[PDB]
């Protein structure tokens, strides 16, 4: 899709405005408007000058503007905005060598994709991701130098609708399911498409949730852990690996999976804790994979045990051969999570890592003398960045990772990790006030 | 001080009610008490049958009843009682063999005592420590399933009544100072004892401070961080080791400092993260303890620094020559965390091991460079468990600690920990609910 | 009706959505909404892969997932639903051998009706059910650790656009009467079917009456005894066997009914506390089966009495002539309960069972000498699931119920009866507060 079809479309529509769009390191989603008579031929090859400061972790003070360039191809009308709006996803460039910004999440996995078809492993990648969100009538949340608070107050019109704008939107949606035994925790599945066009369609779909949700009175959350006892948000990612349009994860090894899959899954269980500090970037991330009942929390492999982080769905067809990670969460950045479980597969399949035997075995049901000897998941964001300090290499094979990225990356994870490590918790005084 | 003088005193004083009290592996002080007509010469060889199941981490289901033996010179009247009552602390004692309770906290302390005589390393060990409160005029704390909250509402007269009262009952008080910059923080400081003495009296200590205040409509706590940004709460422990009436403490070296005193900060410098599980023992500990500013987080020993986790206090006398170690905070218990930091020292002293040099430094202020370098105590409770769960010898040392006892207090803690860590907090909504 | 219809009616009615419904164990109604699009021929031959792990008593955490196999016959536009939806129940199967599942209600209900047809006894059987139900213009209820409440504040417009939707939906309707003396009871009768159609038709009763009285700002509920002193909520059930076009239960015995059904109501008799754990299966069931007044609680038959609790309607007709049990409750699960009633009477039958002699008496008007006598269904839950416990035999006859499934559904409804068992209620404090 080309920018000629793009102004086609202003004119059609009769678009006043075109919402150039980026995500910056946390995830979150930054954006300018400009009037639909200033996109011309031309600002499809110079993009427009922006000031790379104000966001976390990206250019300093000193060092000046980046440049939005936007991919045509991902330009879609905004159902929301009262006066017809274009958005169109944009990447961030250096403005001397118009190259992809180092610390651009988008471009990172751009680079992650053009590594991986470098390599000659594999001609592309399909990710399906499953983010589940906690619908809720009302909450009020805040934390003064006096206390904390939080209070929570608890349909098929909002998902159904919410579908309905997701295809709007340019998303295939495939089933709308409520969870039977979670109070307001509703998943929207849609089809497998490649990292960055799966991630785009992440970010559109956080979007559209967000805003059907406060029109419908309502508040959606992607946090993992919005309440005590019920279960989690979690985002499980389906990867599978395609060259000149067959599976390389077709086999015939365990549940009809192929070596090369084996050792993708060796390289996940390998690095599963520096991946773990960008799949799981959030310490509430880490009140879901909690040592013991219900956490995907056990780094092994099988088709039947469901305590295994990484599961291998059956399917009657070849053509369908994939394994799914549990553990990511949807308060992930897509770019940078889909970005580090590719970069510790291809590493699993570059050096041959075996992942070792199916556990077709019951986790958590195992005595904790052998609960304590399986990999784990990391235990807490320190130790999950600590880890990605210790094992950046993986992350920097073909220059997709810059050390630079990887530390600004962390500094800012820090420094919200540390908020939340200081502040008194409630629960605390529960427990020790009297004591 | 006999059981003579005892029911002379209940004679003398009109006492109407005795009230048996001893304190749990958490802390806390339970008690029972009997009319003052059951305390006959013949109690206090038998003791009261008390059953031993009620309480946590003590005997189970089917190991039965346990005795409570007062210890009579430890008698005083209750001020706060209408009806005229007589405190007696007493030992938990074993019904069949009558000795000492392997999870008694008193008993411990009591034991840990008698090895110290026993060594010959020196005849009695002197504790000052100085726990300070929060004084507050309302708190309303709460958790439900759909959310948690805390709210914190903010003078001479409280801790001058506190100190007449604490004189009441047998504590020599030597100052009553507010804490300059922080509301609320107060500190009274008492003359230093034995350790099983000063650890009775922290007991009176903290049950005359928690009484006063809410005689006067106010709340004190000892919790080591009850408000965010202000400096915690701490307990600072003076140790001084005494033989046939001179320190040991006193010599030529570092700040007039002897051999066996650097040998004894080098014992407490290399266990300190085991003790952190016994002197730091609440997640709340660690909020006071965090990597960074005003922290007595740093493992080394100076005169000068105040960042040094263990002081050595400058006395123009050496009659009075001890270290001041800063770590430990009021929620301690305060028989099994003057245990570990002996047992620590004289595992130090044994083993001649060497605390290194002095830290005449600026830390905090050092680049983090070299603040990753020194040792530091623990980051987290898990991590203080998990280290006391491996280095359990030191305080194995002439059977003072139990390895089932050791065992017992860390599951304890652990349930605890574990209910902190799945509950969802305040802050992590306002930093990744939008997220 | 077949799966080319069903892809016509999408075409024709515009339909956006496609919800499957399914019954767990418990009678629930879960579904899966999946896109119109999504729904192609091939739909109709593999189902949608489902997660068999949240339903409770279904397969568990290492069994994985189940199959929803749609049933095109079912199909009908949802009334409710802004965004034109079309309901099709499906059943649950097994992946591999893609068979009825075992502890599936729909599955057991149609394997009822296969062995039905198997035995030779009768060609099919008719079920006429008569829910009744209460509507409230208001409720609230609740139950925490320091305290319980329920409170309920209690028209033809409401039952009259109520028959309008189940006719609709496909119901044929047939009254529509409010119960005299009973505040808020209303009852809508309905034409009799085939078993499995029939428990289709009673889901879609519910479902239709729940939303209707929500619409209305009413509250409806088919709880067995939602008020006190006033009369309790059932579900009679009419049944007759048909071979060829002919009943069975026309005969010329007693009010004109056949050997055959003096047979199927021995065999009900005999059994009729391992099926009440079936069709009453709540705990508050058996507040309107308290022995003593008005309840349909003696087991024996009668055309004139109506104490017993099987009653043979007189009809001017040999073409309709059926048996009417009276004690089944509306918060049954239909399949499960109707599977029951059948298989014991089939048993019945099979066996020779002779009922005895008609009760054309005046029972609860007898001397309590002879109302202990007679049979009596389950005096409460924990009786009927040890009573189910012990009689499995007669409904494993054909494999229709399996040992596993009985013993999931008995577990599931100990865990129920267990909270209502254990949690304190206000009529015990005002009759042994102050004892």
Known sequence: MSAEHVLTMLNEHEVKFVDLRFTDTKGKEQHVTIP????????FEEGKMFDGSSIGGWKGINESDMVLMPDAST???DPF??????????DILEPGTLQGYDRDPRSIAKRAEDYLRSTGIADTVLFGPEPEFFLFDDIRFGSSISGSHVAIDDAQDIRSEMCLVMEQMGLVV???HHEVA?????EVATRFNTMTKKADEIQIYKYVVHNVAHRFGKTATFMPKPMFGDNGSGMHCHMSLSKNGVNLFA????????????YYIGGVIKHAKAINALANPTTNSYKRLVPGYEAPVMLAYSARNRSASIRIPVVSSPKARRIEVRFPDPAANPYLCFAALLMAGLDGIKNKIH?????????????????????????SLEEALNELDLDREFLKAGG?????????????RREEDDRVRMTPHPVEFELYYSV
């Open 36 to 43: 639909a008579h200033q996109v011309n031929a031309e600002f």
């Open 75 to 77: 330009a879609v009308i």
């Open 81 to 90: 905005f009262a006066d017809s709006t274009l958005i169109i996803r944009c």
């Open 174 to 176: 495939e089933a709308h």
């Open 182 to 186: 979670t109070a307001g925790q509703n």
């Open 251 to 262: 086999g015939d090894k365990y549940a009809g999976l192929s070596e090369q899959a084996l």
């Open 355 to 379: 992942p070792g035997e199916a556990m077709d075995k019951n986790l958590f049901d195992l005595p904790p003398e052998e609960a304590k000897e399986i990999p784990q998941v990391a235990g």
């Open 400 to 412: 997709v990772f810059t050390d630079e990225a990887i530390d600004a990356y962390i500094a800012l």
